[PDB]
Amino acid sequence: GSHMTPKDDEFYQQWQLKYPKLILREASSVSEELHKEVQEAFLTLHKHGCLFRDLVRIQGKDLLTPVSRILIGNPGCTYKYLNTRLFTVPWPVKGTEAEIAAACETFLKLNDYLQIETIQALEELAAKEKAQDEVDIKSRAAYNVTLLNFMDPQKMPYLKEEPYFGMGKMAVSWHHDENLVDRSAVAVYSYSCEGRDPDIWHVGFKISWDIETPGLAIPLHQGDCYFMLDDLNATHQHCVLAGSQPRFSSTHRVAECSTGTLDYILQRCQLALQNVCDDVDNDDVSLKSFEPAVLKQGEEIHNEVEFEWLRQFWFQGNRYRKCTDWWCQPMAQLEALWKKMEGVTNAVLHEVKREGLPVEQRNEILTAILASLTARQNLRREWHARCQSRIARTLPADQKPECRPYWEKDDASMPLPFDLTDIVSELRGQLLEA
Numbered sequence: 001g002s003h004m005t006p007k008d009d010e011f012y013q014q015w016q017l018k019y020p021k022l023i024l025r026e027a028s029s030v031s032e033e034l035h036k037e038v039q040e041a042f043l044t045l046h047k048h049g050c051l052f053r054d055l056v057r058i059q060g061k062d063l064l065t066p067v068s069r070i071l072i073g074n075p076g077c078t079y080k081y082l083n084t085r086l087f088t089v090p091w092p093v094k095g096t097e098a099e100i101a102a103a104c105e106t107f108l109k110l111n112d113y114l115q116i117e118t119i120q121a122l123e124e125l126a127a128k129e130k131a132q133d134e135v136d137i138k139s140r141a142a143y144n145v146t147l148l149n150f151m152d153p154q155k156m157p158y159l160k161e162e163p164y165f166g167m168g169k170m171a172v173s174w175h176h177d178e179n180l181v182d183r184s185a186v187a188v189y190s191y192s193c194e195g196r197d198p199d200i201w202h203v204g205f206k207i208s209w210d211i212e213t214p215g216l217a218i219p220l221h222q223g224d225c226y227f228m229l230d231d232l233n234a235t236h237q238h239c240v241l242a243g244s245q246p247r248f249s250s251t252h253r254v255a256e257c258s259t260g261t262l263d264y265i266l267q268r269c270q271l272a273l274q275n276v277c278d279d280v281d282n283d284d285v286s287l288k289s290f291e292p293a294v295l296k297q298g299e300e301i302h303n304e305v306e307f308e309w310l311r312q313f314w315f316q317g318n319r320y321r322k323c324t325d326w327w328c329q330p331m332a333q334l335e336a337l338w339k340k341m342e343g344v345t346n347a348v349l350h351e352v353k354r355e356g357l358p359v360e361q362r363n364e365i366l367t368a369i370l371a372s373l374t375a376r377q378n379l380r381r382e383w384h385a386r387c388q389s390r391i392a393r394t395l396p397a398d399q400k401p402e403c404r405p406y407w408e409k410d411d412a413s414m415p416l417p418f419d420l421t422d423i424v425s426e427l428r429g430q431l432l433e434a
């Protein structure tokens with residue numbers, strides 16, 4: 001098991017014959033106007049301390065990313081990898097701080113450019129496949145976010161070795177980019193500060209399943225861009241090989257956000273609250289229907305807003321409040337919507353305890369809502385635990401994994417306990433009463 005770089009004669013023909021959906025556009029191809037603007041944006045962003053290592057989960061384990069990052073993109077958009085939902089600090093799409101919003105404006109135009117370069121290469125790539133479709137192409141380049149990366153190999157000197165082709169130290173281990181639109185492209189701007197050369201940053205590629213076809217290590221210099229086209233991200237894996245100097249990168253993606261925008265999730269909540277009499281906002285929640293399919297939907301949306309949104313957000317300690325206040329209000333509103341749903345749940349629970357309610361209808365209600373209440377107990381445990389791992393305590397005071405929402409047994413404001421174990425036990429019991 002070995003690797004190839006431009007030092008090798010076979011490199012170029014291997015690139016052409018076994019990795020042709022990968023494109024390099026060296027630093028020369030990018031206007032010098034742009035290079036300075038985005039390199040300042042990286043630096044300003046870093047200075048204001050907008051880049052955090054993410055507390056991520058993989059194969060059951062809580063791990064911090066070697067790399068520090070921030071997600072920038074369309075307002076209300078999220079990008080989710082390794083069970084962690086990153087929320088965009090927004091960029092001036094038509095429709096917070098002066099210095100910070102300058103960097104975001106910058107990466108938006110980077111986005112515009114990379115998108116342009118991408119559509120072109122996709123057009124060329126299709127043209128080489130002759131020896132409507134233009135909507136497919138344009139959508140697969142419609143980058144809606146970029147995830148920025150930073151590492152200092154010296155200040156962060158805790159790097160794994162590459163296991164298969166001897167490529168050396170990895171800033172990022174072998175992976176596929178998750179949560180991307182099918183066959184959508186990825187475009188990376190690489191900003192270094194200064195066998196394969198250990199001091200230089202590379203991106204590495206291999207075929208999935210394969211450690212016999214030699215991998216490519218491609219040198220990345222200050223300002224070089226690369227592009228993963230079409231199904232490349234699915235058929236191959238990539239990693240980042242660290243150099244010795246620090247480096248930034250901006251990875252532009254077409255996030256599959258069909259259940260991952262603010263608007264999507266507000267609409268979901270609003271769909272749940274249609275089962276609620278909504279003349280007035282108080283604690284006396286009254287439901288229009290107890291048809292199983294509707295109660296189930298309500299409880300599923302309840303879970304969705306709680307775990308994919310509130311807890312994901314608060315798990316990162318409102319670290320983005322340093323960059324924008326953008327999510328602050330929407331997250332308050334989702335909490336407020338969530339609390340009403342606790343009201344809904346409580347009311348369903350009330351109706352299940354009602355005398356003059358035929359067991360048949362009661363058991364139909366139980367069977368509809370049981371899986372959701374179960375999933376809700378287990379995930380509440382998981383998030384509680386994940387919030388209090390010693391790896392999470394070690395973190396600073398502005399990134400402290402807050403377990404929100406959380407309330408004590410004596411809390412008069414909440415109609416239901418955080419711990420649903422007794423509630424769940426009982427409902428399960430009644431369903432087995434024969």
Ligand SMILES: Cc1ccc(Cl)c(Nc2ccccc2C(=O)O)c1Cl
Pocket residue numbers: 056058063064065066067082160170171172173174175176
């Ligand atoms: C699959 C994937 C996706 C994104 C990152 Cl940053 C990584 N890198 C890590 C993430 C968490 C913990 C360790 C690593 C690593 O690179 O060793 C990986 Cl392995």
Ligand SMILES: O=C(O)CNC(=O)C(=O)O
Pocket residue numbers: 147149172177188190203238239240249251
């Ligand atoms: O930084 C790079 O060049 C490659 N980035 C990634 O693979 C990533 O952030 O998912």
Ligand SMILES: [Mn+2]
Pocket residue numbers: 175176177238
């Ligand atoms: Mn990647």
